[PDB]
Scaffold this active site. Structure first.
Site, PDB file in Angstrom:
ATOM      1  N   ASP A  15       2.288 -13.869  -1.127  1.00  0.00           N
ATOM      2  CA  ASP A  15       3.573 -13.517  -0.526  1.00  0.00           C
ATOM      3  C   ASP A  15       3.792 -14.219   0.812  1.00  0.00           C
ATOM      4  O   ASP A  15       4.790 -14.013   1.504  1.00  0.00           O
ATOM      5  CB  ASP A  15       3.666 -11.988  -0.383  1.00  0.00           C
ATOM      6  CG  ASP A  15       2.675 -11.410   0.605  1.00  0.00           C
ATOM      7  OD1 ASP A  15       2.605 -10.170   0.760  1.00  0.00           O
ATOM      8  OD2 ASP A  15       1.935 -12.175   1.261  1.00  0.00           O
ATOM      9  N   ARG A  29       7.222 -14.967   5.188  1.00  0.00           N
ATOM     10  CA  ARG A  29       6.954 -13.888   4.258  1.00  0.00           C
ATOM     11  C   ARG A  29       8.041 -13.903   3.180  1.00  0.00           C
ATOM     12  O   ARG A  29       9.227 -13.942   3.520  1.00  0.00           O
ATOM     13  CB  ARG A  29       6.955 -12.541   4.980  1.00  0.00           C
ATOM     14  CG  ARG A  29       6.985 -11.296   4.107  1.00  0.00           C
ATOM     15  CD  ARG A  29       5.598 -10.997   3.603  1.00  0.00           C
ATOM     16  NE  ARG A  29       5.377  -9.745   2.921  1.00  0.00           N
ATOM     17  CZ  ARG A  29       5.832  -9.345   1.748  1.00  0.00           C
ATOM     18  NH1 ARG A  29       6.621 -10.120   1.020  1.00  0.00           N
ATOM     19  NH2 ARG A  29       5.492  -8.141   1.297  1.00  0.00           N
ATOM     20  N   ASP A  34       6.541  -7.727  -3.376  1.00  0.00           N
ATOM     21  CA  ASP A  34       5.188  -7.364  -2.992  1.00  0.00           C
ATOM     22  C   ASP A  34       4.180  -7.913  -3.990  1.00  0.00           C
ATOM     23  O   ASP A  34       4.241  -7.484  -5.150  1.00  0.00           O
ATOM     24  CB  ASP A  34       4.998  -5.844  -2.941  1.00  0.00           C
ATOM     25  CG  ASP A  34       5.304  -5.224  -1.594  1.00  0.00           C
ATOM     26  OD1 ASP A  34       4.548  -5.479  -0.631  1.00  0.00           O
ATOM     27  OD2 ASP A  34       6.302  -4.473  -1.497  1.00  0.00           O
ATOM     28  N   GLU A  37      -2.669  -8.436  -2.806  1.00  0.00           N
ATOM     29  CA  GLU A  37      -3.131  -9.389  -1.798  1.00  0.00           C
ATOM     30  C   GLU A  37      -4.627  -9.682  -1.915  1.00  0.00           C
ATOM     31  O   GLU A  37      -5.370  -8.924  -2.526  1.00  0.00           O
ATOM     32  CB  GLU A  37      -2.833  -8.897  -0.383  1.00  0.00           C
ATOM     33  CG  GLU A  37      -1.345  -8.838  -0.065  1.00  0.00           C
ATOM     34  CD  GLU A  37      -1.099  -8.046   1.209  1.00  0.00           C
ATOM     35  OE1 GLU A  37      -0.668  -6.880   1.111  1.00  0.00           O
ATOM     36  OE2 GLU A  37      -1.351  -8.606   2.296  1.00  0.00           O
ATOM     37  N   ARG A  81       6.970 -13.450  11.377  1.00  0.00           N
ATOM     38  CA  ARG A  81       7.178 -14.265  10.173  1.00  0.00           C
ATOM     39  C   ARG A  81       8.631 -14.433   9.773  1.00  0.00           C
ATOM     40  O   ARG A  81       9.384 -13.452   9.742  1.00  0.00           O
ATOM     41  CB  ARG A  81       6.410 -13.553   9.046  1.00  0.00           C
ATOM     42  CG  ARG A  81       4.928 -13.457   9.329  1.00  0.00           C
ATOM     43  CD  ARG A  81       4.215 -12.895   8.116  1.00  0.00           C
ATOM     44  NE  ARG A  81       4.613 -11.497   7.904  1.00  0.00           N
ATOM     45  CZ  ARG A  81       4.035 -10.739   6.981  1.00  0.00           C
ATOM     46  NH1 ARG A  81       3.068 -11.246   6.219  1.00  0.00           N
ATOM     47  NH2 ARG A  81       4.441  -9.489   6.838  1.00  0.00           N
TER      48      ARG A  81
END
Length: 135
Positions: A15, A29, A34, A37, A81
């Site tokens: 992401d 970002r 989502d 991660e 970001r």
């Protein structure tokens, strides 16, 4: 909304990607998605994390052109970001991840929600096809 040119610097996670934008290095970002991660000791390398990450990486790495598209609302988050839709040769990376069952549609914050419907449509299809996360 309008697309602008950018140059890949480094893919960081499913992401998040680092880009050269208007001559400054900047971390972006991916808006509205989502992914599982790889970076966060909270859990560590969640399941499909390496996979989501490999997918965004190849996509931006093999592109001839990268473009960034800001939405209507704020353009950076509290960590500095950029918040944006990222395109690799005309194809939205955010959508592709969701289409492949490698990301979910995030919690949405108006007014940064222009492509929300499109993405939810791809997410419904990936669910129906039981892809990856939806397996």
């Amino acid at each position: 909304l309008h697309k602008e040119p950018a140059t890949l610097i480094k893919a960081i996670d499913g992401d998040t990607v680092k880009l050269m934008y208007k001559g400054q290095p900047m971390t972006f970002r991916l808006l509205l998605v989502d992914t599982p991660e790889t970076k966060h000791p909270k859990k560590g390398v969640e399941k499909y994390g390496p996979e989501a990450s490999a997918f965004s990486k190849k996509m931006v790495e093999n592109a001839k052109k990268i473009e960034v598209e800001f939405d209507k609302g704020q353009r950076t988050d509290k960590y500095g970001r950029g918040l944006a839709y990222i395109y690799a040769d005309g194809k939205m990376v955010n959508e592709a991840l969701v289409r492949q069952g490698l990301a979910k549609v995030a919690y949405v914050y108006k007014p940064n929600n222009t492509h929300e419907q499109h993405l939810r449509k791809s997410e419904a299809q990936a669910k129906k096809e039981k892809l990856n996360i939806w397996s």
